Amino acid sequence: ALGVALIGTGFMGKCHAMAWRNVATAFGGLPPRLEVLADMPADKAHSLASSFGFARGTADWREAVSDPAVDVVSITTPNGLHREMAEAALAAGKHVWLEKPMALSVEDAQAMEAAARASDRRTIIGYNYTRSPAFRAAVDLIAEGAIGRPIHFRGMYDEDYMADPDLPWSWRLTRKDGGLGALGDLGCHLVSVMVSLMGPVARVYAQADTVITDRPHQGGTARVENEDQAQALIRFASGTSGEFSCSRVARGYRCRLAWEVQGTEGTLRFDQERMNELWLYQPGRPEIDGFRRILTGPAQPGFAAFCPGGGHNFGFNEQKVVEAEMLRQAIAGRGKAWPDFTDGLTIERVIHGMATSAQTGQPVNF
Amino acid sequence: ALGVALIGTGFMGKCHAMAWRNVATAFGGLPPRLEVLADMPADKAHSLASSFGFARGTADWREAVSDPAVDVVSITTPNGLHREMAEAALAAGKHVWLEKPMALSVEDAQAMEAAARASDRRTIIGYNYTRSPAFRAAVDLIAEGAIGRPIHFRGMYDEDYMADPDPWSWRLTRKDGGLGALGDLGCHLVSVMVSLMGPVARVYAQADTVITDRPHQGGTARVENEDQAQALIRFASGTSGEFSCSRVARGYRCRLAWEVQGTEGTLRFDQERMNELWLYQPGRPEIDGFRRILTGPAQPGFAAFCPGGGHNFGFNEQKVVEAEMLRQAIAGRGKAWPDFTDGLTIERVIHGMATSAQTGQPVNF
Amino acid sequence: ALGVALIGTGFMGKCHAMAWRNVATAFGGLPPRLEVLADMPADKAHSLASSFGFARGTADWREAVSDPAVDVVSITTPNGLHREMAEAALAAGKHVWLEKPMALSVEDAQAMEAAARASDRRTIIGYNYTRSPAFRAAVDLIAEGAIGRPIHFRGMYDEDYMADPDLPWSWRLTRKDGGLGALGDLGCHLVSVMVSLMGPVARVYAQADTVITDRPHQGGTARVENEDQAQALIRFASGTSGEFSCSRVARGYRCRLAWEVQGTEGTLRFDQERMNELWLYQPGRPEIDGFRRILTGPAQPGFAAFCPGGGHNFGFNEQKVVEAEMLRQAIAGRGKAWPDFTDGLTIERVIHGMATSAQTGQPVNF
Amino acid sequence: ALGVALIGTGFMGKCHAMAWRNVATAFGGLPPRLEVLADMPADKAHSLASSFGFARGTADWREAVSDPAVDVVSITTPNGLHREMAEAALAAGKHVWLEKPMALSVEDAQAMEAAARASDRRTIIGYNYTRSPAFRAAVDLIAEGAIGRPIHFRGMYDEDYMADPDLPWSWRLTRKDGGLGALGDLGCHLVSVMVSLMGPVARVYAQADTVITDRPHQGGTARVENEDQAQALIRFASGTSGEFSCSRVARGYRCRLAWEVQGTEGTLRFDQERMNELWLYQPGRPEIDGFRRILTGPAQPGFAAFCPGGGHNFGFNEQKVVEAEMLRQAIAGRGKAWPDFTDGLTIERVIHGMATSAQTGQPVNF
Ligand SMILES: NC(=O)c1ccc[n+]([C@@H]2O[C@H](COP(=O)([O-])OP(=O)(O)OC[C@H]3O[C@@H](n4cnc5c(N)ncnc54)[C@H](O)[C@@H]3O)[C@@H](O)[C@H]2O)c1
Ligand SMILES: NC(=O)c1ccc[n+]([C@@H]2O[C@H](COP(=O)([O-])OP(=O)(O)OC[C@H]3O[C@@H](n4cnc5c(N)ncnc54)[C@H](O)[C@@H]3O)[C@@H](O)[C@H]2O)c1
Ligand SMILES: NC(=O)c1ccc[n+]([C@@H]2O[C@H](COP(=O)([O-])OP(=O)(O)OC[C@H]3O[C@@H](n4cnc5c(N)ncnc54)[C@H](O)[C@@H]3O)[C@@H](O)[C@H]2O)c1
Ligand SMILES: NC(=O)c1ccc[n+]([C@@H]2O[C@H](COP(=O)([O-])OP(=O)(O)OC[C@H]3O[C@@H](n4cnc5c(N)ncnc54)[C@H](O)[C@@H]3O)[C@@H](O)[C@H]2O)c1
Ligand SMILES: O[C@H]1[C@H](O)[C@@H](O)[C@H](O)[C@@H](O)[C@H]1O
Ligand SMILES: O[C@H]1[C@H](O)[C@@H](O)[C@H](O)[C@@H](O)[C@H]1O
Ligand SMILES: O[C@H]1[C@H](O)[C@@H](O)[C@H](O)[C@@H](O)[C@H]1O
């Protein structure tokens, strides 16, 4: 069994834990051994290792990535910590499951990518919205020619977690430790999905905005630095056109990663807030012509490992189980995992390229 | 930590396995120990006990219920085994997580309800559709007066797994399944309905078998029970109700959809979109209409799985919540619903409906 | 050109006026001659006669009905006035376009039916939800065998126009002017749709409720004389099962006439609040299997006469234009108007049979 | 009564006819007298003038614009004739209801604008998607402060009427006729809506494609000369951002003019294919937080003129009756008609500016 370390226990830390714990339940093989949990403070690491079923808990992550019983390290700590912990893991000869985005900057991502290439260990970044059965059915459909040649992509990713202007400031909202705003938190997820459907991005023209430029900082106010929303027009390497957006201030949306691929012979549309539906249009006779609602079931990739009956809604967390497995297969030498630090660095260059574009009012070519 | 035995590894068996494995991960406390898994043949039981992380797999269910390390038994076998397995598990001093419906008959459920009181062990029936954050949110809203006085209920549960020509399940026999759509789906619809409306007083029902033989069985494969059924309800309150279920309603996969029309509002839900609760309350005319409430941390259960609203809660995660309730009842910190007593009433409703359909007569409770 | 008389100018009266005005615009032939309009008081009739484009107004309907420049009469007055007005019109040798339901009782409907047969004039009842391109396409699809044989019908008609208890007492709530409550006002519509799709009703078992027992009336407090809601289980002459309901207190719904036909080889589903969509499931390959959203367009009956492009939503009022056209054609002998007073009589026996079942607690066979 | 001439009887011609016959029926006043109808050949004009309720049909549009009994002229002919016809109507001192877009080029629009100012006659351009009860409710909800300050617009207009590559090379596909492609046919309508929500446009950056470049043409094939789809990033004069697209080859879509405004305090979203629904998000307590589905009814502007009860879906064609009313009110010197040829000119510069941008690869500033 694969020896597992986990660093962090928050939103993603718990998600990885629940995933590791059931990956063998779903897909077979041996359950991974949950060796070490790292979080701060110590008493919290001990508590959570107990209730997560980990063999021990530590307040010292370096110990976790060092442990001889570990082969793989889940890294679910804040973006400013990714580079250091990732690199230390790879140097200790461990495979790495790293949360997105890779780091704060393209330069950090590049350093990490070089580390990974040296190491010969397997890596994967936590672009979990590419794990849904519906998204994977969509990719297969386009490959099968269900919509002919793609002629346009339109995608968005709206959430409203920062829309309230009273929400307190933090260094996340600075360029340092924070990095990009909406592009770094959400943009990257959209790019991960978009390039899987349409191929590599050849060019972007973008614009960005900070809507809420000043926030309470225990007293007066602090200037928010990164962007609350960004949009971009795209040209892919195939030459086809695309539209792109992201926002952390789009009121009423909670997880609205929504995309569509219009093709010569059809159209596919999807909204993550209803992650179990794939809308497919193909030309038919006039009398019955129209979009089909394909409800996620065992006909789609990965679904049948969790449930034999269609229409039993596949959940967000279960995406993470599929991700664990893809890494599990890569480590077992049986299948390449996407995206690794090399694949992820391209995604980093895209979102940062869009940021550069926005600042300059000039298109950026990749 | 609770010792767990699991009987069955099919649709619901595998579901219970995933739930027991993550109950503590979501809700804290100590993770349950996965002790014994039972299924046939033995080779299958062995491989799956290993992948599911169970200490052993066996082809002998009695071995699972008698393991001293076990405190609780998940029974996920065909309906025709529920009674024997549940009564054995109770007599063995184990708490029971029994899959719905209880058994083949009301008499069976009567026997099991008596045993459950005698055992002084906790019981819960697998009505996992009452565990969604959206559903739990609805109940709380109604109790708050959000929709005022419930004046009508309209409920359905449509699926189409029997509509497919390609097959043969135990669900189609009287000795393995019992009732057809009413036993396999109807009961779920009842569990939801009485949780919203209070107990049933009267039913008038009708039923049909639309596919009499399983096309690809070689031999005769007579469907021994109903493919669909509908009923008018009167609740103990005096309120009206519409009820139906079907395993042949083509294009539906898990369409357990209900609504409660109140004097002050309406609540509506469809399990195919289990993350949405529609709420209408009267407002200013210029902004009047139903609200799509997207499941999130403000709903019961959800926060334990995710701090961000809109990250769709899953079918399988309803089962994690179900497990947590049994586990809280087991610790004397809550009361599990429905136990074998509450479940008995449910069996009466669906079997009353089946009777009403057989006789062309109303049935009172 | 056909000579028109119109009695009433409210909800349906204005609908009828608008329909006659554009019937020839839509379908060709000669525009009807808008001859006489009748409403009270007189000032109101002459005023609306002017704005509706009618040659004259009057406060006395009887004159309008026997005016020799009139060939057809639209009757859009409360239910209590239907029988008298229709019987008078027919006996003058005029065709009649009558608002639903026929009158207060089954006896009224039998009286009206007899008068119509003796008069040898055309009649049509205003069941306008049978006139939508989506509905008519549904009936055709069933006929062509798109969903095999029907095995179940589930229908409802929810509105909340009496859901607020403060709303004033109105004629729809009296047995003298309305007759039945939600069964008379909404239920009849549901039946007209249901029988078009499933065939005749063989049996019903029903229950009914008055949720708001009293209402403000000028001074205050008046008792509601008929039902706010009703439901019924149906057996059709075919043997097939049905579910049926209606309500005027169903909070949040405005025109939710929603039905579905579940067949052996597919399913059809419709909701009048989205009267441009017809949902059709037929079995398909697993990977693309699901309900189609058919958007109303020129391939559906009647639509091409209003617009040559699909997706330009056909409206409520245009159903009435279709309805006038079917009446014109019938009067000219080139078509059948459905439902006439005879077909209308059947509809009335169903709804009153439901009322009876509700009162007795026993099934009612037809 | 207003004297009305109508030129053209097709898609919009017939829609204008239906609108002029019921404008008074809906909003009171005197019914406009339908004087002259022009279309070709003559026999068709005679036939349709009879069935449209027009006093006479003619094959010569110039006759209609000069008739002394005419006060206002509807112009529903292809784009290349708009300039000529409008300028002539105005020269004869007639009021003008002109179909979109104004013409083939900015230059044309400039001349027509000056022509319009030179006469002292009313003009309105046929941007009917701004007449819907839902849209007008949206605008008033914003003006009422419903969503705070707009911070982003996302708009699209997808149709597939050109998706089939075997459709014959026809007028919307030419420069000399047609002008722009998707931008001139669908884009303009999106801008009409967009500037009504976000105000004027400061800057665009756009991309465009011809996806089907060749089409059957009398035993041969001809080159398509304008775009099938276009997209743009927008910077509004207010400093706010926007996304914009249109397409005539977006498979499955029939009239998908969908738009969204995300504000500091709320969100509004709309889709013409369901023109009777308006989605509104305002912050609520978390228990009941979410988008409201607002079903078009009497609370929304214009609706009560057509129907006293909500839910009775307002049609595409009834947008035009509203448009007619707005014009009658402007002629009567009450309400002003938007957009006139001056507001229209701006919309033309925008769509042509996107076209320029897409052609050159450069941002275009206004
Ligand atoms: N893939 C996805 O869908 C997704 C979703 C949410 C967050 N994320 C990513 O997950 C990462 C964490 O996000 P989150 O929402 O879980 O943040 P969080 O604040 O919920 O959790 C951070 C975790 O890291 C721990 N931590 C912080 N500093 C530490 C240190 N020095 N040593 C050990 N532990 C430390 C915290 O105590 C906590 O356990 C971020 O990189 C974010 O981008 C990804
Ligand atoms: N709550 C739910 O949503 C849900 C879903 C599916 C089934 N169910 C209920 O759960 C139960 C199981 O249904 P399922 O769909 O998982 O059926 P299934 O056929 O998929 O699984 C049944 C399992 O029981 C095992 N089994 C059969 N006979 C056995 C024996 N003699 N000893 C030990 N194991 C035996 C089978 O080998 C199989 O592993 C039924 O009671 C059903 O009504 C509930
Ligand atoms: N088919 C449909 O979709 C539809 C929709 C709404 C109403 N209806 C039916 O239309 C009919 C009228 O409904 P409504 O909502 O228009 O009612 P309403 O209250 O709007 O109008 C009643 C009309 O009758 C007139 N009236 C009353 N007494 C009269 C008399 N003695 N002489 C002349 N005119 C008289 C009133 O002045 C008014 O014009 C009813 O039978 C109702 O069932 C049908
Ligand atoms: N606002 C909308 O929703 C909408 C919808 C469709 C079209 N349009 C616009 O309406 C206009 C017409 O498009 P359509 O789809 O109605 O085209 P169409 O081809 O359906 O009809 C064109 C009409 O113009 C007539 N015509 C052509 N040359 C003429 C001449 N010399 N004299 C008189 N009549 C002549 C044709 O006979 C026909 O009646 C275009 O400018 C288009 O952009 C707007
Ligand atoms: O598919 C159905 C349904 O999904 C229920 O959840 C399950 O309990 C039934 O046994 C199964 O037959
Ligand atoms: O709003 C309702 C309903 O829309 C019916 O169409 C109409 O016939 C009723 O009389 C009216 O009350
Ligand atoms: O079908 C399209 C579109 O629906 C618009 O309504 C119209 O203005 C266009 O000209 C027509 O091409």
Numbering used by the authors:
A (entry chain C), C (entry chain B), D (entry chain A): 7 to 372
B (entry chain D): 7 to 172, 174 to 372
What's written in the study?
The enzyme, therefore, turned out to be scyllo-inositol dehydrogenase with L-glucose dehydrogenase activity (P. laeviglucosivorans scyllo-inositol dehydrogenase; Pl-scyllo-IDH). Further analysis showed that the enzyme oxidized L-glucose to L-glucono-1,5-lactone as the first step in the pathway for L-glucose metabolism. Pl-scyllo-IDH formed a homo-tetrameric structure in the asymmetric unit, and this structure was considered the biologically relevant form, since a similar unit has been observed for myo-IDH from B. subtilis and GFOR from Zymmomonas mobilis. The N-terminal domain adopted a Rossmann fold motif for the binding of NAD+, and the C-terminal domain bound substrate.
Since Pl-scyllo-IDH also oxidizes scyllo-inositol and myo-inositol, the complex structures of Pl-scyllo-IDH with scyllo-inosose and myo-inositol were also determined. Both inositols bound to the catalytic site in essentially the same manner as each other, where residues K106, Y135, Y163, E165, R178, D191, and H318 formed hydrogen bonds with the hydroxyl oxygen of the sugar. All six inositol hydroxyl oxygens were involved in hydrogen bonds, including bipartite and tripartite bonds making for a total of eleven bonds. On the other hand, in the case of the inositols, R178 was positioned inside the active site in order to be able to interact with the substrates. In the case of myo-inositol binding, based on the shape of the electron density map, the 4’-OH formed a hydrogen bond with K106, which suggests that the reaction product is L-epi-2-inosose. myo-IDH from B. subtilis is known to oxidize 2ʹ-OH of myo-inositol resulting in scyllo-inosose production. Therefore, Pl-scyllo-IDH may have a different regioselectivity with myo-IDH toward myo-inositol. Therefore, L-epi-2-inosose can be a substrate for Pl-scyllo-IDH, and the enzyme is highly possible to be the first enzyme catalyzing reversible oxidation of myo-inositol to L-epi-2-inosose. Based on the crystal structure of Pl-scyllo-IDH complexed with inositols, side chains of D191 and H195 were found to be oriented to K106; on the other hand, in the structure complexed with L-glucono-1,5-lactone, the side chain of D191 was parallel to the sugar plane and extended outward from the active site. The corresponding distances in the myo-inositol and scyllo-inosose complexes were 2.8 Å and 3.1 Å, respectively, and the relative positions of NAD+ and the inositols were the same as those seen in the lactone complex.
